[PDB]
Design a protein around this ligand. Structure first.
Ligand code: BR
Ligand code: BR
Ligand code: BR
Ligand code: BR
Ligand code: ZN
Ligand code: ZN
Ligand code: ZN
Ligand code: ZN
Ligand code: ZN
Ligand code: ZN
Ligand code: ZN
Ligand code: ZN
Ligand code: ZN
Ligand code: ZN
Ligand code: ZN
Ligand code: ZN
Ligand code: ZN
Ligand code: ZN
Ligand code: ZN
Lengths: 112, 111, 111, 112
């Protein structure tokens, strides 16, 4: 299992959100360096979001480009995109960050 | 009044209006219905408790959200959404919001 | 097996283990118990349907989370958390996760 | 009713999260631009978070400094902070962004 997985469930259809761009960024100085970008697969997943580069401890941000996702469906959303910031304090462990998504609401958490 | 509920449709970011919500008390066997009402235009029922003092114990509100979506020609995972909660202090304000989507929801103790 | 559930404790970011979960079917305004089990160390019940053929209908899983918290001397707003859902298609997989805190939760149809 | 209100509910206590720093930023051309900073009162609320300048349409973000909030209680959290990004498409509307907060999970939405 990859250090970082993400997935998106669309709570309006009760199905995965497919083909959503998701970026990964590392905090550095007062900003953020992009480490990767990928798109959720047909099951709404990116099982392995970390690039082929050793992960270091630090703070990271995943950005779910959900605004574009909704825009392709002619749907408005309150959020142009959804950033989620989290600590990686242990590079030996698996980090899983699902997104439960609606147009005007969402939930995120550390999964298993 | 010791019990308020509201429903926010997370798909529209607007209140769910005219949704039937029931209130029940847990009895020794089964439940007893205390009240029924409908959310107003702001998705609220400000005063869901009937005109009777509350006692400590378990209660259940049931948001009839399947009907609400059906009127929109929309399918939902849930026929309805029961929320069971515990009243421990009887003169305290209890607030049970529902953040609703067709295939997902959240509830909590509100302010 | 057509029904899985899991519970994630949003306060620890870890699964909720050894939580009792019942499954019931709706019948005549009541509910018939069909099975009961305990989430494993991963907070999962992979196969909650009993070993009889599934039928269409409405069903209710009840996560005994008030008991889960009480074991840890933690109070909860909710003595248990019922989730009601349609089964329209008997051949498909139904997955009902619970994101759990003492005074709030979320549930949805998972993948 | 104010262009921007936020509040926080601690889902672990079922009570408001108090004295939590919240910043407001606009997505300006030169990067994100701080507009205001403020603290939830005892009720976990900031009922007017907009500064004393006219609002324009555009993208904005509030950052709830919840990592600090938990750190004061000797509690760990997955998130150092929680940014929430959103569109203001109509300046004469009221935007309300609640946060339902747990150590390893949160929800947010456009409230009323
Ligand atoms: Br995944
Ligand atoms: Br209300
Ligand atoms: Br499972
Ligand atoms: Br507020
Ligand atoms: Zn996943
Ligand atoms: Zn960190
Ligand atoms: Zn995982
Ligand atoms: Zn894992
Ligand atoms: Zn309310
Ligand atoms: Zn009770
Ligand atoms: Zn209230
Ligand atoms: Zn209150
Ligand atoms: Zn599961
Ligand atoms: Zn049904
Ligand atoms: Zn499943
Ligand atoms: Zn499945
Ligand atoms: Zn508020
Ligand atoms: Zn915008
Ligand atoms: Zn408001």
């Amino acid at each position: 299992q990859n250090i970082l997985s993400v997935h998106i469930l669309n709570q309006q259809t009760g199905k995965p959100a497919a083909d959503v761009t998701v970026t990964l960024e590392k905090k550095a100085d007062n900003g953020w360096l992009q480490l990767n970008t990928a798109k959720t697969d047909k099951d709404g997943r990116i099982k392995a979001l970390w690039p082929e580069q050793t992960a270091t401890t630090g703070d990271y941000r995943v950005v779910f480009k959900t605004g574009d996702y909704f825009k392709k469906q002619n749907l408005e959303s309150f959020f142009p995109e959804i950033p989620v910031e989290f600590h990686i304090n242990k590079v030996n462990e698996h980090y899983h960050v699902p997104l439960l998504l609606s147009q005007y609401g969402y939930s995120t958490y550390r999964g298993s």
